[PDB]
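Below is a filled-in request sheet from our internal design queue. Each sheet records the structural input a requester submitted and the sequence that came back. We keep these sheets so that new team members can see what a complete request looks like end to end.

REQUESTER: design group, bay 2
PRIORITY: normal
MODE: inverse folding
CHAIN LENGTH: 435
BACKBONE (tokenized):
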């Protein structure tokens, strides 16, 4: 699918890919180089799996946190901006995409979660997490809710987990100490406990995901959500009169969102490295280029100084940078995805009641040092067999499969194909796995 003299680009489905495609059509008009923008599911998992070979796209877009792992594995071309080009972008954004000395991607924009609120339900939004139970009660009476946001992705809960002292890897000297993990300290427990009580007290549902929370906010049913700049386009379109503001504090500490830098990497395997560079440097990272993407879905505070100077005038963007400042830039180290999986698991388990907070975070501290494991058949499993534990073991494999953490829930569910011993159990092999 990668061919000399064409570009294939991958970007996430929540970003402005139609806008990016317009930049691509301008590139093609100038250069004769066809550009195809795709937004695959699980692209960030898909990329390391397929570029491992020589496949995948010429250009990949993601937050910088995933980049060091791609670099560590040799999947990224070292990029070669000249000093004048580097000077067009904020130094702290190049920092985000520097790994083991080398620039491994182009920074595009600075993403931080903010509190989004409906001015016609809550004209004065809460300054603290602690007042939200009371607010939800008052609003429940009016047939509304106070707050909904995606609880299936740790990105969204981390600001609260971090507020009172949770952290990922301790930053010491000038290094991240990957032996000093902070997902199971007192502050982390306090934050996750506070969320678990929101659910226990019926102020939030453990099953709330991205699209549920978005539909509810945009339909005027809940007073508040937590989301990024990319979400503002759809709220605009729904004519909710909304504001963007600083996240609530918890125990008098600011929420500390993990800050991402949307970045564009060039595939080490691409025979279009120069074309990709000229697309990125001369078409995308221009006022016009970024405008076109931003108009589709807002980017946040862009890395390009000249266009940010304009965007910075928007209170929404100032709100984004205030939240950014209170939070922390994500590491880009390879251990970041293991960290995220460990915390994903902990949050989902604690919130659903499958595990206590303390137990869930103890497991997260241990798992942050490991890697996401998948279900592997421990026996020949004939077609239509109801799964028992002795049929399933756990292994760190690529491509990943059903999460090993799902084994208990798999018990009694049926496979729809014969699964040989040692085969990775995939989601499409199990009947009813969608639920
Ligand atoms: O939860 C499992 C998940 O963990 C890792 O995903 C994290 C991303 O790496 C990280 O950048 C961030 O993702 C957010 C984006 O930055 C933002 O642009 C927007 O698209 O929302 C994203 C959150 O949904 O946080 C997530 C974790 O929540 C890991 O790399 C993934 O492969 C893995 O599936």
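RETURNED SEQUENCE:
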């Amino acid at each position: 699918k990668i061919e000399e003299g064409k570009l294939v680009i991958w970007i996430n489905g929540d970003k402005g890919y139609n806008g990016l495609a317009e930049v691509g059509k301008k590139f093609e008009k100038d250069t004769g180089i066809k550009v195809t923008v795709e937004h695959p599911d699980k692209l960030e998992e898909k990329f390391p799996q397929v570029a491992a070979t020589g496949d995948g796209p010429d250009i990949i877009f993601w937050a910088h946190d995933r980049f060091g792992g791609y670099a560590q594995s040799g999947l990224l071309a070292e990029i070669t901006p000249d000093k004048a080009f580097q000077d067009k972008l904020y130094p702290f954004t190049w920092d985000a995409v520097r790994y083991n000395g080398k620039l491994i991607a182009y920074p595009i924009a600075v993403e931080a979660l903010s509190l989004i609120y409906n001015k016609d339900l809550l004209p004065n939004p809460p300054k603290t997490w602690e007042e939200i139970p009371a607010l939800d009660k008052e609003l429940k009476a009016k047939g509304k809710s106070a707050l909904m946001f995606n609880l299936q992705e740790p990105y969204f809960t981390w600001p609260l987990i971090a507020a009172d002292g949770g952290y990922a890897f301790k930053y010491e000297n000038g290094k991240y100490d990957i032996k000093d993990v902070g997902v199971d300290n007192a502050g982390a427990k306090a934050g996750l406990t506070f969320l678990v009580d929101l659910i226990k007290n019926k102020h939030m549902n453990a099953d709330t995901d991205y699209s549920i929370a978005e539909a509810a906010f945009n339909k005027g049913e809940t007073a508040m959500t937590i989301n990024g700049p990319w979400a503002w386009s759809n709220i605009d379109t729904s004519k909710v009169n909304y504001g963007v503001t600083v996240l609530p504090t918890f125990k008098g500490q600011p929420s500390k969102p993990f800050v991402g830098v949307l970045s564009a990497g060039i595939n080490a395997a691409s025979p279009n490295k120069e074309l990709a560079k000229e697309f990125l440097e001369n078409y995308l990272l221009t006022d016009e280029g970024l405008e076109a993407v931003n108009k589709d879905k807002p980017l946040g505070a862009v890395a390009l100084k000249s266009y940010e100077e304009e965007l910075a005038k928007d209170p929404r963007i100032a709100a984004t940078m205030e939240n950014a400042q209170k939070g922390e830039i994500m590491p880009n180290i390879p251990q970041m995805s293991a960290f995220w999986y460990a915390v994903r698991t902990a949050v989902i388990n604690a919130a659903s009641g499958r595990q206590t907070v303390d137990a869930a975070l103890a497991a997260a501290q241990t798992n942050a040092a490991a890697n996401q494991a998948s279900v592997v058949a421990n026996q020949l499993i004939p077609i239509n067999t109801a799964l028992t534990l002795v049929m399933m073991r756990s292994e760190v494999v690529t491509p990943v499969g059903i999460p090993a953490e799902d084994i208990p829930r798999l018990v009694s569910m049926q496979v729809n194909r014969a699964v040989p011993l040692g085969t990775t159990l995939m989601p499409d092999m199990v009947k009813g796995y969608a639920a």
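SHEET NOTES:
- The chain has 17 helices and 19 strands.
- The CA atoms of residues 234 and 353 lie 33 Å apart.
FILED BY: M.R.
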